Structure formats: structure tokens, C-alpha cells
């Protein structure tokens, strides 16, 4: 028999109007084990292999808030991985596997598994449709806007066929003025609508809920302070440096996955930001820098 | 059933007199799966669990050299993990599982496995003797002075018992003047006698053969260039910076894991080096910083 | 029926077998109020407009806000036309109304939500039905829909001599084509019920003014028009096409 | 069969539990462990050390009564293990309490939201609603921790971690109960139930002679001051022996109060006191026993005994 | 049951540093039977069908060199067909099926086969990952600099499902100034980074080891002679002609399929080369043009 | 499928069970010619572009213009995606 793995997926933040996978597109919750959002602990095993096959899948929304904040969390599975995110509130019952209850009460949803071996995404494939097992979509619509409602767990029995040299679990992203985040050599901790640069400032929203390690490489002309807040606190040893036209810093912070209308990591005060290069690693608290 | 895992352990560098782990101490090849020298890929899987159990264990040293160089390579398995090095030649064949042949010709060695569950190395043990499954020692003792001779692979069927969150992909090591490497919360990826500092210079010997990401945080007074030595090469993007009394650099380099009498990463030219702090991540040929 | 309406385009007759309404609360026993659920056999009556009419309609459940309801509607055996190529007397076509009256709250809070169950069966098939509205407004008039379906309804839009507004309350993601007979240019903003997928490309030219917007509405009330065109002069006709398109059918700068 | 199943849930109001003892014989044994103090940001074992709850019978936090019977034996098992969080609050206060068991006894604690859910064996419900966690047992015999070992991983059975976040700040939210059937194999004479802990400048606590009342992240020394954060909740008996150059005063902080006849004395380079205090184990950001006002503190040596309110000295 | 098919794949040219398909990209050895590098004879049978199924797959690298040259040759089978190259040494043995020995000594490697039917490559795919059966990679990494070391054979039992008309024996490739090779309706037989043009010259590197028939159609302004380089030799009948702005040649040459730092077919001496169009046919020692 | 394409929008997977092609003539035995009906297992090949490729594709019926044809296509059991996005 296999081994179950309970894994944290989201911290569900409620909404008033209508909202999909909360701040993000219909790209986040792909059913591949090469996805840090749905698989925070199996992505390290998924870097060693190229074929997977799912056996048991349950979603387990567990509430956290007091029973005073009305809401409706829905959990939806697609067989596609390229269908668009749902548009209305009432385009929810038209899916195949769906559980939609109130915010304050726990749920469950079982997903029937196939028997086909599928590729583990270390790419840059064009068709995600034939690779993934499907999407997971999470919808909130009543109210109780800025409140951590609950959190969604996920249980798996994943087996892997033929191995591989390890896919490098360190991102590498580049921003230009007017550009977006563009990943390089994987994985997908950051999605492209997660950052912004100006002529003087810089910011990153991080919602995967881990403890990470940055290496800022920012091309500016003056120095700038680096503040960490909103979703994440410093494991406070953030040592930066200046020199030539580069700006180099290294940060250890612990995000919490919750949305906020403040960037998690923010760089301000400088002038003429042109490029920002990143590396994120998912480290632990012992990887700080002694003053 | 299981899945085998062929993994690179060393690249054997021959020596005239007598040498046990081609220079490194009797600490390198502990048979825990939390040991990146022995498990460059399984340590990512093993960072999620607390108990393990080995099922199949084989060597297979494989040569790389022409049949012109005399020499002798031996492979050794202690059941202890705290015995000392094999000081003489008569001690080499006296171990429980030992195979010793010439340099130019291949070998194999099987280790009989137990059925007990042992803990995975987490941040501190003192009696390794009860946690590890044993050592591996690799003696070379006649004249094939330091030419690359061959390399040693290792096969496993490893199963793990109850899970855990991820522990540490990243090291933190700190050097003071006169002191040595002291790691804090990571794997290893370095070990103490593999770095040296002076009043003005700095060096790292990396013999693990991966592709890494450093963050040099060096308390200096003046700037200093960073070269990449004979063991390893850059990917030509070593963006660094100065600022306050710190010196901050971030390098992506790939090492062959071979002995050389040059530091693999060297930092010289400055003055009054007092502390050096590190973070090593094992990236890929991605995360380099675009100019 | 945001999903069955596409399958309803391929058929002509329908029944309705099982009908339950299953209001689920989302609130503690702290907030007062009342929610009532009403089914009419007419499909063209008005709504209360009193407390007198809420209780005894014919078939109504009117419990409190914090407590669950359940209403069942008895069915028939008749076959009725699916509404295509819009009729006027839509009383012999529809099966009835739902009315959903609340009062004496607990003001604008997510109190609960209403679920609806159906077993719908369809008799003989069509080729399709054109799922794109065509609605026209004149000065002083209202919306008059052509070509079907019923995204917008006649008390949803207003025109002036210089401005224009739509209150889209269906909660999807849509695709407009404004064709407005003006004399000057103007701007189009997206109000409270909805947001852009922000590359709405428009153009002026002759007496027409042609835009093409992609917005995502939520259906919640707001006292701003969800799509507003203002700043022009001498608006006389506004013609529409709405399509329910996803977030990839936007134009590109 | 209509493909959508409506199920109704009636969340009533405050749920509580009522606990009686019988007790009968000359063995399940329920005990309190903590009172769960909710916090806003993120917190482990609620301000206590990173190592505190630790499955030996020679552990004062989990077994304040069995630790005396554990001194007379060497081996132990643990048969039945349940954790039975009982709420004390209505459905009005938000928050989350999680209960975690490690198979290690030397890991650290989260330090994230990521690590709370999937540890291996964890129950993570809300504050106002009851939990129940069971731990599967083994059949091995392990040493009772006497004459303190270093690698206490092969000795203990594991940890308990008790993580709360996103409260409901510092309110008596609930409390955690613990059940055991402990059996003991071959007996000792006794074990010395008096700690001996030593601090140097820059160092931490290093315990000798056992048991584990104080743990190394509980004390701090300076050149002139000294402080202890006793978080075990008993009534104790100290003997401060502090190597100073001047005299000083000893006050009793927030976690504890005197039985107010603490007699101390100065003399040679030593400074010797003897205090009887009663601690509560709740957090407070004051040292529970504080010695300040002196100069050149180098060593502080301790003896702690768990004595009742009659072992105080008399003016 | 079937009929085995021993087929020449490469001729291994050793290199000092690290090299993956002796220079050519990670596109060459796709395991479709529409791949003339891996199937120099079965591609004619495979041009009649749409589905295929591999049954037996073996290597057998065979050396050609004296036992005086040190070196190491490795043979690799990805199950992916879109993974990147093995950047370092530790990645070599970490594949699913991998055998690595010295240069002077023979090997073998068996690949376990599936039972699925996959499409044969017809003129365009983007996700090769679902069409091919995998890659083959051939790493050499120590010092036997570029001497012919050995050659690698390949064995198959291939069965095909439902037929089709013949597709393409002949390539059409077009080069513009600054551009690269872009093939139109053929096999390959060339691949892009194997030709170079200047304002006055032209060259082709052919590493497939067959006997071909070219038709050079080069838009020139002046004439130019055509030589046949170091990889390949003429059969001495290279009749060419000039006329209008086109230059038309037709050559029959036989290539050994070995690396050389000379273009195998070179066209120089003219001026203002703008387009070069090709057609390659794999003739025999017949079709040369009698003077 | 000008009618099923609307019902195909409401689903993701499909099969095809029975496939017949049933060319019906509308002309006497006076007009010469040839009509062939071809099924590929590919969906991205090109078309002939010769007389050579018409006859032996894999599964083809190639009678005259004035005379009736009938071609059947064997099915599979696999589920395939409806082409969306
Ligand atoms: Ca791969
Ligand atoms: Ca009426
Ligand atoms: Ca552990
Ligand atoms: Ca085809």
C-alpha cells in the first residue's frame, strides 16, 4: 500500500464580489506533482522523476474563523487544465465534481483517479492539457472580505515511474520596466502577475506559504532599503550590500499565503530600476546571516 | 519491487602514499540519506521524512583512465560510523565488505541490508554510531598521483516511514578569524576543513560535484574581486556589490567534484576580512543573473 | 441555468420535473431579518411592494434569515416552448417566477444563498439558437431585445442626451459591441458591478461610435452603472451584442 | 441520486465537556498539560521552549505525578496516547489550535503555516470546537532519562507541539488533556530529583544530575543581572550560588510569587540565596526569578526541588 | 518472432571537457522511427505508416581505438524527449537506463519497451514529449580529444499499424543571410545549426554517415567552385553550372559521419550569396554524373 | 457537426462509436469521373497531390461518380478532449 500525504494548498480568503483562485489566474492549481502550490512536499520528490500516476485524491477544506462571517467556499475539479476560470457565481453547478458550502463548516470532495502514466512538467510544454490531470478551482462569494476563512488540505497517494537527474528547485525571474515576471529553469513559486517595478521602487507578492531565500540582483543607480511585511516577517538578519550599478541583497522570510494589499517583499527609495533578477529556494530558519 | 537510484558518490583521485577519502575526513560518507555526498538526489526525498530503511546497496567503481597508470582503489563498508581511518594497508581488506582492485578496471560490492528503521540526520546528533547505517571509505595507495582515475556509483532501494515538513536545502556556514567552518541548519555541501580565511583573502574547496548558488556576505573594509578556480567554472554572471562594511556577492557555479590545489571559489584583494557567511542551494544553469 | 442554456439552444420543448428551493444560511443567531421564497404561476406579474403579499402568495416559505428554508414546487406534464425568437406574451411559455423577498434586516451583508434543483427533459431538437443579444434603445424608450437570450432586461439601461448606462446583473464575463449614434466622441468606464479586462479598444469615425468591451460582472447591487458611456452629445440609438466570452477574447494594444 | 445532496448542519453555540474522576484496585490517567492561550501572529508551545513537551515519564511537564514513580524504574513503554483538547469558549472567537506529534524528539517547531497541517499525525481544528488526536504505540522498551544523555532521540518517544495562530489573543481559550497507560520494567534504587544547572557568560544552561525542570532556552546572564523563566507550574525551592563581586537583590517576577521569606546572604566571592516561589507556567515578559544589581556575574549554579509551602525559611 | 535491425547511430568523438551529442543539440536522437540518425534503414519502412511500437531496444557501443587513450563514454535514455542536456557529471548516472564505461572497452544497454502506439513524426509537432519514445544522449567527458573512439549500434523489433502513402525521402532547406537552416517537408539529414553562410561563402556539416545527393541552388552574382571537405569525399563527378543569378550544382558524396573542423561540403569564391536551397536524397555510388 | 457543436461546448471528453460514409450519387450513367473517400488516423497530414496516394491510404473507397459508395471506420475506446482553448 501507498503512503498518504496531507498537504496545505491555500489559506482561503473570503471575498465580497466574486473571486477565483484568489489573486491568481487559472494556471496555479495544475494537477502535476511539479507544482509547489498543490504539492509543497512532493515537489521535492517530483524533481527526481518523469512519470507519475495518482491513486487517491481528497480535498479537505477545514475552517478557521468563528461562525459569524457568512461565505461560500467552493472546490471544483476540471478534467481539463486549459479551460478558463469560471466567470459568474452561477457557473459553478455546471462542473462535474464540486462541493460548495458555507465558510464556517468543513467539507470533503473525492476525485476519481485514472490509471494512465503522465509526464511530470519540467518545461515549457505548450499543451498542459495532455500532461496535467486537471485543474482545481476555488471560489468565494458572499462577503467577509479581508478575513482568513479557512485552509484547504489535500491528500495523495502518488507513485512515480522512471527516474531523472534532479530538476533544479530554484526559480530565476527577470523583470524589465513595463515587463512582467518571466520564469527561467523552473519551478513555479512565483506567477507572472506577482510583481511590479517603477522607476524607483519594487515589490513581490508571495502566496505559497513557505520560508524562502531571495537573492535580489537589482540594477539601480542609488541604494535602497528593503522592507518585509504584509504577509511575511523577516527572520531578521537581512544583509544587503552595494557596490557598482548592481544592488545585491539576501533575505530570509516566512510567508503565510494569505492575500494582502501590501507587497510581501518591497524595495524602495532608490532611483532608475531597470532589471530585477531573483532566485528563490524554500530554505529553513537556520539559513540566515549573522550580523 | 522498489526503484533503484544510481547516484554519483566521488570522482577518485589517486595518490602515491595513502589516502582515505581523497583528503577529506572520516565524516563525509555517513550512510544517512541526509548526506548529499552519498545521496545527491535522494536527499530531497529524504528531507520529508524521519525514518528510513535501506534495502539494496551496491558499489561499482567505474574507471575513466587509460591502462597505463598503476594504482589501486579500494571500497570499504564499516558497520560503525565512528571508527577511524584505515591507517595501514593490512587494515584495508580486513573490513566486513571490501573490494580492492586496480585503477584501470571496474569493480562491484554489495552490502547486506538490515530491516531496522533509523532516524534521518536532523541538525544535531553526537552518537552517529546509532543513527547512520555505516561509513563508506575509499582508499587509494599506490602511484597514480593526482590524475582523475574513475568514479564510484551507488544504488539504493530506500523506503521512508512517517512524514515531516521539509528541513533544509540551504546551508548557513560562518567563519571567523582563526576559526573554521561551523554550519547552522543545513545539509553538507561543505564540510569544517574545506575553507580558509586570512586577513585579506578567502577560499572554498567544494568537492561534491553539483551546480550551486552562493551568497557571500563578507564583513570587509575594501572591495575585492571573486574568481572561480580549477575545480569549478562560472556561468558568466557573477554579479556582486559593495556598500557598507559588508561585501555581498551571489555566484552560480558548477563544480566537477575533483581535487585540485586551487580553491574552487576564491575571494581575494580586500583587507580586514573578519566574518564570511554562506548560503548554498544547488541550483541549475538557470538562476544566473542577467546583466 | 447558466450551463443548461447552451443545451437548451439545441431543443424546442421542455418540462420541469423536480423543483426545490433550498436557502442555506451563512450567519449565526445574532442577525435579525426575514427571507421569503415565492413561486408564481404567472410569469408576468409584478412583485411586492408590501408586507401583505409576501406571506400568502400561493406557495411560499418565509422563515428568518439565520434559519434554513426549503420550498418545493409541484410540476406539470405539459410541454412548453423554449424561448427562442422572443415572443411577447411570455406567460404561456415560462413555468413561472421566483421572487426572493427580504426585509427588516441586517443590511447589506452576505446573509445566505439560494440553491435550485431541476430535472429538465427536452423534446425535439433545433439546429441551434443564436446566443447573442441585440438590444436597441431610443430616447425616452427602454430596451427592446431581439434575437435572444435574456441577459439584459428592459429595466436595466437608461440613455440621456449625453450619457449612457447599463446595469448588468447576470454575473458572467461578457463581450459588448457598443454602437452609439452620437455627434461627438466619448469615454467608456466600467462601474461597480464589474471590472475590465483592461484593454477595451474603441474608435470613432462617422456618426456611429463603436466600442468593444470585455467585462466581468458580479451581479451584486451597486448604485453606479456597470458599463457607462458618458461625455458625448446627442445620443439617439444604442445597439448591443453580448456574448459571454472568457478572458482571452479581449483585444490587444 | 439527483447528483446534489443537500445536508444541513446546525452549529449550536458553545460546546463544552465535563470531566469526572472515579477513581476506583491499589491504568488510564488523564492530566492537564496546558491552558491554550491564543495568539494573533504565530506561536508554538505557547511561549515555552522548543523542546518542552517530550514523551518520557521523567518529564515534569507531561507527568508531574508519575515522575516520582518513574525514578524507581529504568524501562518504560507507552500503550495508549490520546490528546483531547477541550474548548472553554463560545462560537464567537475565531482562531486555530493544532496538536502535533513528532517521532523525533529533537526537531524544531514551525515557524510557518506550511508545517502545521501535514506533519505526520496532526489535528488542526478551530478554537471553539473540540479535537481528539490518537498516537499509535510501539512495543519497544526505552530508557527512562536518568544521568542525562545527549542524543535524547533514542530515549524519548516524541514531542508534542501545540501550535496556535490567528486569534483571539491572550485569552483562556481551551485546555489540553493527555491519557497514558505507562508500564515500567526493572527497578532502580531511585533517581536524584534535584537539578544542577550551570551558566557561563555567553553560554546557556547545561543541566546535570536530572530531571528537566529548566531547559537551556530559559535563562540569561549578563555582566550584572540574571533571570530565569520557570515554565513548569509548581512550587519550587532554589539555591542560587552566583559568583559575583558585589551583593544584589532577588525579585520574583510575573510567572510566580514568593512565599515571602526568601533569605539570602553574601560573604566571599559567592552569593548564596534560597527562594521558595510558586509558578503558574503562563507567559509573562518578565523573568520569573530575577537577580539584578550586582557586578561581574560569571557562574550561576542551581538546585531545584519542588517543595511545598512549608519548606520556607523563617525571619 | 520479429526481425532485429542492427543500425549505426554515431561514431563517437571524444572530448576533454563535457559534450552531449558530440556537439549537436538535444534534438538529434528522438526515438521516432522517422529519424535518420537513429534509423538509417527503418525510416524507409516507417515512411509508409502512421503508428509504431517498439519491442526490443539495445545499445552496444563498440570501440575502435587502441588501449592507450583514457576517456569515458556514457549512454543515456530519457523517457522524456524534451529534457535538457546533462550539464554536469553527477547527472550522467542518474538517468533511468544508463551505462558508462571507458573508451577502449565495449558496453551494452537494454531499454524496457511499452505497448502503446505512438504517431510517427509528420512534418510538424510541437510537443514531441507525447509522440517520441524518448531521447538518447551520448556523453563523453574526459581526455580523448577529438580522435575517433568507437561507434554505437542499435537494435529494434518495430511493428507498425495502419498504412499511409510515402511521405518524404528528400529534404528542402533554405538559408537566408543571418538566418539558419529551416527545413520544409523532409526528414533530417541536416539539422538548424549545421550550415553557415557569409556574403561570399557557404558550408555544410553533415554528421549522419550516408551517401547523399545534393542540389545546390544558390542565388549568386559570380560563379564559385565546390570542394568536399574532411568528413566526406567526392565520387569524382561533381558537375555544376552557372547561368542567370542562380548557381546550380549537383554532387554525390559519401560522409563518414565524424566530427571535423572543416565543412563537409563547402562553396566559396563567389560574391553576394543570399539564398541557398537544398535537396538531399541518400543515393548510392551509382547516380554520379558521367563526364 | 453543425448541430452537435453546441452540445459539444458543454462537455470535455468524447468518443465516436459508429462511423459510416455513404456517398449518394445524383447523376445517370453518362458522366465519367471518380470520387474517393479517405480516412486518416493522423489529423495533421496533407492531402494528395497525386493519383498514387488516393487508392492505398489505409481505409479508402474509390468508386466511380455515378455509382454509390459506403465506407466504415473502425472505432476505439479512448476518451479524447473536445477542442477548446
Ligand atoms: Ca523530465
Ligand atoms: Ca398573476
Ligand atoms: Ca524529524
Ligand atoms: Ca500521417
DSSP state of B129: G
Which residues are CB-neighbours of B20 under 8 A, at least 6 positions away?
B26, B85, B86, B137, B138, B139
Q: Does residue D41 share a domain with residue D180?
A: yes
How many Cβ atoms are within 10 Å of F53's Cβ, its own excluded? 18
Quote the ligand 2 centre to C45 CA distance (angstroms): 5
Beta strands in A79-128 (DSSP E): 97-101, 109-111, 118-119
Question: What is the grid cell recorded at D193?
Answer: 530529583
- How many whole angstroms separate alpha carbon B43 and alpha carbon B34? 5
Question: What is the domain extent for residue B223?
Answer: 167-291
Contact between E192 and E174 (Cβ < 8 Å): no
- How many whole angstroms separate alpha carbon C211 and alpha carbon C194? 17
- D190-196 contacts: CB < 8 A, separation 24 or more? D190/D71, D190/D72, D191/D58, D191/D70, D191/D71, D191/D72, D191/D144, D191/D146, D193/D67, D193/D68, D193/D71, D193/D305, D193/D306, D194/D303, D194/D304, D194/D305, D195/D302, D195/D303, D195/D304, D196/D301, D196/D302, D196/D303
**Torsion angles phi and psi, residue B193, rounded to 5:** -80, 50
Q: Which ligand is nearest to the CA of E94?
A: 1
A63/D92 Cβ within 8 A:
no
Q: Look-up: residue for cell 509504431? A: E52
Contact between F48 and F40 (Cβ < 8 Å): no
Instruction: Spell out which residues of chain A touch residue F81, defining contact as CB-CB under 8 Å.
Output: 80, 129-130
What is the torsion angle, in degrees rounded to the nearest 10, for the CA atoms of residue C236, residue C241, residue C247 and residue C249? -100
Q: Does residue C194 share a domain with residue C104?
A: no
Query: How near does any CA of chain E get to the CA of A192, in Å?
Result: 23
Question: What is the grid cell recorded at E152?
Answer: 554505437
Question: What is the grid cell recorded at A172?
Answer: 530565476
Sign of the C-alpha dihedral, residues C87, C89, C90, C92?
A: negative
- How many whole angstroms separate alpha carbon A71 and alpha carbon A14? 7
Q: Does residue B172 share a domain with residue B81?
A: no
Instruction: Spell out which residues of chain C touch residue A18, defining contact as CB-CB under 8 Å.
Output: 171, 216, 218-219
Q: Look-up: residue for cell 481528539? A: D132
Instruction: Spell out which residues of chain C touch residue D91, defining contact as CB-CB under 8 Å.
Output: 28
Which of C76, C103, C128 is the last residue before a domain boundary?
A: C128
* Helix, coil or strand: residue A94: coil
Quote the ligand 1 centre to E22 CA distance (angstroms): 21
Q: Give the domain CATH number at E64.
A: 2.60.120.20
What is the torsion angle, in degrees rounded to the nearest 10, for the CA atoms of residue B91, residue B97, residue B102 and residue B104? -150
Query: Residue B169: enclosing H or E segment and its boundaries?
Result: none
Query: Residue B31: enclosing H or E segment and its boundaries?
Result: none
- How many whole angstroms separate alpha carbon C163 and alpha carbon C184? 12
How many Cβ atoms are within 10 Å of D193's Cβ, its own excluded? 18
Residue C44 φ/ψ region, left for φ over 0, alpha for ψ in the -120 to 50 degree band, beta for the rest: alpha
Instruction: Spell out which residues of chain D touch residue B160, defining contact as CB-CB under 8 Å.
Output: none
Contact between C132 and C122 (Cβ < 8 Å): no
Q: In chain D, which among 55-114 make CB contacts under 8 A with chain C?
A: 91
Contact between D58 and D191 (Cβ < 8 Å): yes
Which residues are CB-neighbours of E102 under 8 A, at least 6 positions away?
B63, B64, B65, E70, E71, E72, E73
Closest alpha carbon to D36 in D286, D255, D215, D281: D281
- How many whole angstroms separate alpha carbon E90 and alpha carbon B8? 5
F6/C10 Cβ within 8 A:
yes
Question: What is the grid cell recorded at C177?
Answer: 459591441
Q: Which ligand is nearest to the CA of A123?
A: 1
Q: Is residue D137 part of a domain?
A: yes
Contact between E147 and E14 (Cβ < 8 Å): yes
Contact between D214 and D304 (Cβ < 8 Å): yes
End-to-end CA distance of chain A: 49
Closest alpha carbon to C165 in C237, C76, C226, C102: C226
DSSP state of D307: -
D154/B125 Cβ within 8 A:
no
Which residues are CB-neighbours of E225 under 8 A, at least 6 positions away?
E267, E268, E269
- The yes-or-no reply on D/C contact (3 CB pairs or more, < 8 Å) is yes
Cβ burial of B125 (10 Å; 0-12, 13-18, 19+) is: buried
Give the burial string for D31-67 (b: 16+ CB within 10 Å, else e): eebbbbbbbeebbbbbebbbbbbbbbbbbbbbbbebb
Contact between B92 and B100 (Cβ < 8 Å): yes
Query: Residue A15: enclosing H or E segment and its boundaries?
Result: strand A5-15
* Helix, coil or strand: residue E43: helix
Q: Does residue E206 share a domain with residue E155?
A: no
Helices of type H across chain A:
43-46
Q: Look-up: residue for cell 555567553? A: D202
- How many whole angstroms separate alpha carbon C137 and alpha carbon C239? 7
Query: How near does any CA of chain E get to the CA of B161, in Å?
Result: 24
- How many whole angstroms separate alpha carbon B272 and alpha carbon B281? 27
Q: In chain F, which among 5-24 make CB contacts under 8 A with chain C?
A: 6-7, 9-10
- How many whole angstroms separate alpha carbon C208 and alpha carbon C234? 11
Q: Tell how strand D133-135 and strand D172-179 pair up.
A: unpaired
A153/D126 Cβ within 8 A:
no
- How many whole angstroms separate alpha carbon C69 and alpha carbon E38? 70
* Helix, coil or strand: residue A105: coil
- How many whole angstroms separate alpha carbon C93 and alpha carbon C86? 10
- How many whole angstroms separate alpha carbon D65 and alpha carbon D193? 13
Alpha carbon C67 to its chain centroid, in Å, reads 28
3-state helix, strand, coil in chain B (%, to 5): 5, 35, 65
Q: How far is CA C237 from CA A138, C208, C209, in A?
A: 41, 9, 10
What is the torsion angle, in degrees rounded to the nearest 10, for the CA atoms of residue F9, residue F11, residue F16 and residue F20? -30
Question: What is the grid cell recorded at E276?
Answer: 541557398
R_g of chain C, CA atoms, integer Å: 20
Q: Across chain B, which distance is largest between two alpha carbons, in Å?
A: 59
Contact between C77 and C15 (Cβ < 8 Å): yes
Count of domains in chain A? 2
Query: Residue D60: enclosing H or E segment and its boundaries?
Result: none
CB pairs under 8 A between C and D: 12
Q: Look-up: residue for cell 526541588? A: D305
Q: Which ligand is nearest to the CA of B48?
A: 3
- How many whole angstroms separate alpha carbon D238 and alpha carbon F53? 101
- How many whole angstroms separate alpha carbon B6 and alpha carbon B11? 15
Question: What is the grid cell recorded at B206?
Answer: 567544494
* Helix, coil or strand: residue B202: strand
Closest alpha carbon to E83 in E44, E26, E122, E130: E26
Which residues are CB-neighbours of E216 under 8 A, at least 6 positions away?
E226, E240, E247, E248, E249, E250, E251, E267, E276, E277, E278
- How many whole angstroms separate alpha carbon D56 and alpha carbon D144? 7
Chosen from C11, C125, C128, C248 to mutate, greatest number of chain F CBs within 10 A: C128
- How many whole angstroms separate alpha carbon C145 and alpha carbon C163? 20
Expt. technique? cryo-EM
D118/A8 Cβ within 8 A:
yes
Query: How near does any CA of chain D get to the CA of B195, in Å?
Result: 26
Which residues are CB-neighbours of C87 under 8 A, at least 6 positions away?
C81, C93
Chosen from D3, D6, D7 to mutate, greatest number of chain C CBs within 10 A: D6
Bridge partner list, D43: D164
Q: Look-up: residue for cell 558518490? A: B9
Length of chain E: 291
Q: Does residue A178 share a domain with residue A43?
A: no
End-to-end CA distance of chain E: 49
Q: In chain A, which among 230-249 make CB contacts under 8 A with chain B?
A: 239-244, 246-249
State whether residue B123 sits within 8 Å of chain D by CB: yes
End-to-end CA distance of chain B: 49
Contact between B173 and B277 (Cβ < 8 Å): yes
**Cα angle A30, E119, F46; round to 5:** 110
Contact between E139 and E86 (Cβ < 8 Å): yes
**Torsion angles phi and psi, residue C158, rounded to 5:** -140, 140
Q: Is residue D260 part of a domain?
A: yes
Instruction: Spell out which residues of chain E touch residue F57, defining contact as CB-CB under 8 Å.
Output: 163-165
3-state helix, strand, coil in chain E (%, to 5): 5, 35, 65
Q: Does residue E204 share a domain with residue E82?
A: no
Cβ burial of D207 (10 Å; 0-12, 13-18, 19+) is: middle
Closest alpha carbon to D9 in D129, D167, D108, D115: D129
Query: Residue D86: enclosing H or E segment and its boundaries?
Result: strand D86-87
- How many whole angstroms separate alpha carbon B210 and alpha carbon D229? 46
- How many whole angstroms separate alpha carbon C239 and alpha carbon B58? 78
Q: Which ligand is nearest to the CA of C91?
A: 2
Query: How near does any CA of chain C get to the CA of F50, in Å?
Result: 38
Instruction: Spell out which residues of chain F touch residue C248, defining contact as CB-CB under 8 Å.
Output: 85
Closest alpha carbon to D59 in D173, D182, D141, D165: D182
* Helix, coil or strand: residue F7: helix
Q: Across chain C, which distance is largest between two alpha carbons, in Å?
A: 61
Closest alpha carbon to C169 in C124, C208, C123, C221: C221
Query: How near does any CA of chain E get to the CA of A25, in Å?
Result: 23
Closest alpha carbon to B151 in B208, B198, B227: B208
Quote the ligand 2 centre to C43 CA distance (angstroms): 7
Instruction: Spell out which residues of chain A touch residue C217, defining contact as CB-CB under 8 Å.
Output: 88
Closest alpha carbon to E196 in E266, E269, E260: E266
Name subunits touching E (3+ CB pairs < 8 A): A, B, F
Which residues are CB-neighbours of C147 under 8 A, at least 6 positions away?
C85, C86, C130, C132, C133, C134
- How many whole angstroms separate alpha carbon B241 and alpha carbon B263? 22
Closest alpha carbon to D165 in D16, D36, D11: D36
Quote the ligand 3 centre to D35 CA distance (angstroms): 26
Contact between D165 and D37 (Cβ < 8 Å): no
- How many whole angstroms separate alpha carbon C159 and alpha carbon A55? 58
Which residues are CB-neighbours of B260 under 8 A, at least 6 positions away?
B229, B230, B231
- How many whole angstroms separate alpha carbon C169 and alpha carbon C226? 9
Query: How near does any CA of chain C get to the CA of D87, in Å?
Result: 19
- How many whole angstroms separate alpha carbon E120 and alpha carbon E187? 12
Q: What does the H/E/C string look like for E85-154?
A: CCCCCCCCCCCCEEEEEECCCCCCCEECCCCCCEECCCCCCCCHHHCCCCECEEEECCCCCCCEEEEEEE
Q: Does residue A288 share a domain with residue A189?
A: yes
Q: Does residue B235 share a domain with residue B99?
A: no
Which of A166, A186, A212 is the last residue before a domain boundary?
A: A166
* Helix, coil or strand: residue B203: strand
Q: Does residue E265 share a domain with residue E213?
A: yes
3-state helix, strand, coil in chain A (%, to 5): 0, 40, 60
Nearest to D4 among C28, C68, C117 (CB): C117
Cβ burial of F25 (10 Å; 0-12, 13-18, 19+) is: middle
Q: Does residue A128 share a domain with residue A266?
A: no
Contact between B248 and B215 (Cβ < 8 Å): yes
Contact between C83 and C89 (Cβ < 8 Å): no
Q: Does residue E188 share a domain with residue E157?
A: no
Query: Residue B126: enclosing H or E segment and its boundaries?
Result: none
Number of helices and strands (H, E) in chain B? Answer: 1, 20
Which of A108, A141, A166 is the last residue before a domain boundary?
A: A166
Nearest to E94 among A119, A126, A165 (CB): A165
* Helix, coil or strand: residue A32: coil
- How many whole angstroms separate alpha carbon E72 and alpha carbon E66? 14
- How many whole angstroms separate alpha carbon F5 and alpha carbon C128? 9
Residue E103 φ/ψ region, left for φ over 0, alpha for ψ in the -120 to 50 degree band, beta for the rest: alpha
Question: What is the grid cell recorded at B94?
Answer: 580486513
Chosen from E34, E123, E162 to mutate, greatest number of chain F CBs within 10 A: E162
- How many whole angstroms separate alpha carbon D207 and alpha carbon D216? 8
Question: What is the grid cell recorded at B133?
Answer: 547505517
Alpha carbon D127 to its chain centroid, in Å, reads 21
Q: How many CA atoms lie within 13 A of A175 on its CB side?
A: 27
Q: Across chain F, which distance is largest between two alpha carbons, in Å?
A: 48
Question: What is the grid cell recorded at A107?
Answer: 467539507
Q: Does residue C167 share a domain with residue C48?
A: no
A123/E82 Cβ within 8 A:
yes
Name subunits touching F (3+ CB pairs < 8 A): A, C, E
Which residues are CB-neighbours of B240 under 8 A, at least 6 positions away?
A241, A243, A246, A248, B216, B226, B247, B248, B249, B250, B251
Closest alpha carbon to A69 in C109, B229, E262: C109
Q: How many CA atoms lie within 13 A of D88 on its CB side?
A: 13
- How many whole angstroms separate alpha carbon B42 and alpha carbon B94? 30
Amino acid at each position: 500500500r501507498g503512503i498518504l500525504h496531507t498537504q496545505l494548498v491555500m489559506s482561503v480568503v473570503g471575498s465580497v464580489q466574486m473571486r477565483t483562485n484568489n489573486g491568481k489566474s487559472n494556471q496555479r492549481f495544475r494537477l502535476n506533482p511539479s507544482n509547489p502550490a498543490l504539492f509543497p512536499t512532493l515537489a521535492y520528490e517530483a524533481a527526481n522523476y518523469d512519470m507519475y500516476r495518482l491513486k487517491k485524491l481528497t480535498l479537505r477544506y477545514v475552517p478557521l474563523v468563528t461562525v459569524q462571517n457568512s461565505g461560500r467556499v467552493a472546490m471544483i475539479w476540471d478534467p481539463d487544465s486549459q479551460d478558463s476560470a469560471p466567470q459568474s457565481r452561477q457557473e459553478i453547478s455546471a462542473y462535474s465534481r464540486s462541493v460548495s458550502t458555507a465558510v464556517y463548516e468543513k467539507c470533503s470532495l473525492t476525485i476519481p483517479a485514472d490509471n494512465q502514466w503522465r509526464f511530470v512538467a519540467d518545461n515549457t510544454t505548450v499543451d498542459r492539457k495532455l500532461v496535467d490531470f486537471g485543474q482545481l478551482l476555488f471560489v468565494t462569494h458572499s462577503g467577509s472580505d479581508g478575513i482568513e476563512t479557512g485552509d484547504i488540505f489535500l491528500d495523495c497517494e502518488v507513485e512515480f515511474k522512471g527516474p531523472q537527474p534532479t530538476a533544479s528547485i530554484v526559480q530565476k525571474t527577470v523583470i524589465d520596466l513595463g515587463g512582467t515576471l518571466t520564469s527561467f529553469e523552473g519551478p513555479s513559486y512565483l506567477m507572472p502577475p506577482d510583481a511590479f517595478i517603477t522607476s524607483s521602487s519594487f515589490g513581490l507578492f508571495v502566496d505559497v506559504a513557505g520560508t524562502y531565500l531571495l537573492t535580489l540582483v537589482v540594477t539601480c543607480s542609488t541604494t535602497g532599503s528593503v522592507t518585509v511585511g504584509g504577509n511575511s516577517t523577516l527572520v531578521g538578519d537581512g544583509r544587503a550590500a552595494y557596490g557598482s550599478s548592481n544592488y545585491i541583497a539576501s533575505i530570509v522570510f516566512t510567508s503565510s499565503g494569505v492575500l494582502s494589499t501590501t507587497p510581501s517583499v518591497q524595495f524602495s527609495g532608490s532611483s532608475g530600476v531597470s532589471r530585477v533578477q531573483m532566485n528563490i529556494c524554500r530554505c529553513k530558519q537556520g539559513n540566515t546571516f549573522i550580523l
